[model samples]
Target: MKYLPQQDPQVFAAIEQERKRQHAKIELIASENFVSRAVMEAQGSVLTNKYAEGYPGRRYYGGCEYVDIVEELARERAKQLFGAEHANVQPHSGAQANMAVYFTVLEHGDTVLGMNLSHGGHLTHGSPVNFSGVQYNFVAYGVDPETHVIDYDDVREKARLHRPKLIVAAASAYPRIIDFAKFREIADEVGAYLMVDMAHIAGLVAAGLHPNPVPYAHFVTTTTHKTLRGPRGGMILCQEQFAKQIDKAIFPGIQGGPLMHVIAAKAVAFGEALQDDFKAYAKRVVDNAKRLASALQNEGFTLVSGGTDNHLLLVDLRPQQLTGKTAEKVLDEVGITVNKATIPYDPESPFVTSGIRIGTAAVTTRGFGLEEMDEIAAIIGLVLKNVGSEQALEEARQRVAALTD
Candidate 1:
């Protein structure tokens, strides 16, 4: 049912091998998922040939009437999905989405505050290596070392002192629920704009399992792929007052020539999320994550933030006498894929991190429920027990292989 006439058999064969690898391994990457066939089909549809740049009706190019409707469907679906007053489904990645938000709300050198990079914030949220940090006056709030979670009092104190123009919430590695209400309060106290980058939990939030940031945050940004299970694309949501500037910011502000095919695929995903079954699946994802975290902790592993209140947890490897790199490599050897991440107050270098982040979103999409989570935990625990022993690793490898068989 698929064609690859232009490809070599060797190359094409590897794609199948990779597919088999994915089927065999336990994917713990926090930001990955297996999108539905419908989403994939839409992504590869004839819509790829179009270039309707400017928005739905006011197109800069001709011969875009059909694409106009396609784009509008995506926009409307996105708006309905998030209960957003306005939606821009054109951003190519989450990073670009944040860039558009910054362009829309603030000028260069404008003061902005976000959670610290080492504490679970994204690159766009004031990482020094990122354009945001270099261009803006950036300040960061971090978790308390004792409690191992975000402290609103510290944030409030910092906000009152810094008086930033914008405050960005939502994070990549944080394992707790962000209090958008508190963030809104802090933002209002300083007349700052609040933006929640809900890229990590958009699916859960859409399902009503997680708290929505829309009511309090002025603007929200997210990648549709992470938990929304769509193709790689981004969306911007905000109140009606910010609509015009946000649209202009997305277009002439940063990127050019939108990915129409991805947008169509996003429409399909949003449609899927609207279904009742999707909510059940979302809750299952959280359940699996909690089970995995508990299993790891029971095995004497230290989790970065004590435990997760969401879809992922940061496993602190230092207590186990394991570097994050080693744990990641050894886990992959036993058919478990995880990412090396920095602990909030990490003293180690970023290259070899102090923690590893694990999630259940991808596995949940593979039809893996609680039973699979239990099996995955057993295999991962076995691997950790034998972290450096080749024979033990080989035994666990066979266990995973047996599961595939």
Candidate 2:
């Protein structure tokens, strides 16, 4: 940063602006969090200068001696954090980690079952536009319309009909606890491989607050950021039997070189996760989310699934006659950042969705508790209720500023 400040003032100024923005906003985005300074230091270290093109001991290049230690530490720490038999901390992002799993097991035209994107699934879980859908024939399963919970019977029916080679059990916006064991039963009944993307709830799983997918799925994947509070990277966890295949799929199959610095950052974060304070922090995240849900509901806002069991809540904005896009913009105006999310079976298009996704991970990381969550809900209610009123918007903005300050 010092060199960049002198060499490129404009870029330095933009970085400073982002820093200020982070400090001055109430961040409630479900898929975002603030990394610790130690994580940042590891991510910005000299390990980035090395090119370790392969696994620790097995590399394609020289001068990888030290980076080998860093990568091995990351891999070991990741495995320990999740109680997995094997860990591959090489994929650049969560999507690629999933891609590697697909590369490991499925063929180009294999049949697969996944959750629907419109019903709380990730793009990698067979959005028609993504490579997973284009390469494989993907059948989608979704939540029950009445309860907004996973319809296991529907998923079983789809599996029986499709006879898929893979069944993905995960969601990007799902609120309740996922039954990985039930998913395993379905996959076993149909002779399909099971994969769970725990990117959004990795920290909770690590802290024993959420069900760990490791003991139930053939493969598990996650982003090191999100609730993990690590670097912006990915990691894969699998049984020891699939370790070699997963490694080859990631290294020689898809990506060329792994980010060693980020791996070092992940190692640091994993170490932090092993500490008792991280468990406390994770519990606070869930606690704050529950409190936020209650406060929002008290304001007459409808929440998807009636509430949340994890770190995020999907608020249905239709009761207030608001679109998710408008709600997001208005909330941003008040220095409260959140993302537009599509509710299950949403009637609106993706761009003009009927809901907003909010979480307590980032705010919890910044030490905000249940009281702050209640205040945040109040601010959101005020902004959405008085969207077109300049006087009300100004008042909400001032309250938000005071909270952030």
Candidate 3:
């Protein structure tokens, strides 16, 4: 940072600005969280200069001993945290993690069944614009319109109809528990491999607050950030039977060299997640989600599932006659950062959705709890309810600044 400030004033200023913004806002983005300083230190370590072209003790490049230790530590910690037989901590991001799994098991034009994007599935989960969809034939199954929960029957029907080579059990904005067992059952019936992207809830699963998908799915992918409170990176877990293919798919198939520093950071975060304090944090995250869901409902917003059973809530803003874009802006103006998300069977286009996704992981990481969530809910309600008045907006901004301060 010393040299950065002297050599690149503009970049240094932007970095300082971002640091200040993070400290000064209430972040409710479901896929975001604050990493510990230890994690940051590891990510910024000298290991960033190394080049490790392969797995630990089996690298193709020299000077990989220390980098190998870092990679192995991350892999082992991830396996232990998720109770998986094998783990690959090399994928640069969750999307890459999923791609590696697909490369391992799927062929060009292979049929894959996944959750519908509008129903909470991620873009990599067979969205037509992604590589998975372009290279493979993808069939989509969605939630129950009335309940906003995964329709298992529809999944079974799709599996039967498509007889897919793979079935994906994952979501980007879901608020309920994912039934990995049911997904496994359908995969078994259809003779398909089951892969789950637990990027959003890896921390919850690690803390035993949510069901683990490792024992059920053939391949599980996740990001180290989010509720895990780690660096931005990805990891994959699978049975030992697929270890070789998974490693090859990651090393030479998708990426060349792993980020040794980020791997070290992942190790630090996984170590943190193994502690008892993280268990308490995970539980608090869910409790805050439920509390905030109630508070938002009290303010007359309709939640996708009526309530939340996890760290995020997808709030339909039609009742308030607000587009997700407007709601995001109003909240951002008041120092609360959130993202617009698509609700199941959303009537609006993706650019102008009718829902906002909210989570308590980042706030809970900052030491907020049920009381703070209630206050946050009120702040959000106040800002959106009085969007037309400059005075009310100013008052809401003050309340937010007071909380952040």
Question: TM-score per candidate, in order?
Answer: 0.96, 0.99, 0.98
* Candidate lDDT values, in order: 0.87, 0.92, 0.92
Q: Which residue pairs in model 3 clash with each other?
A: none
Model 1: lDDT of residue 127: 78
Clashes of each: 0, 0, 0
Q: Residues 211-276, candidate 2, lDDT per residue (tens digit)?
A: 999999999999999998889988899999999999999989999988999999999999999999
Model 1, range 267-362, lDDT digits (tens) per residue? 889999998899988998899888888877777788877888888999887777777888888888788789999987887888898889998899
Estimate, for each residue in 230-296, the C-alpha lDDT of model 3 and write its tens digit.
8998899999999999999998999998898999999999999999999999999999999999998
After superposing all C-alphas onto the true structure, candidate 2 shows an RMSD in angstroms of: 0.9
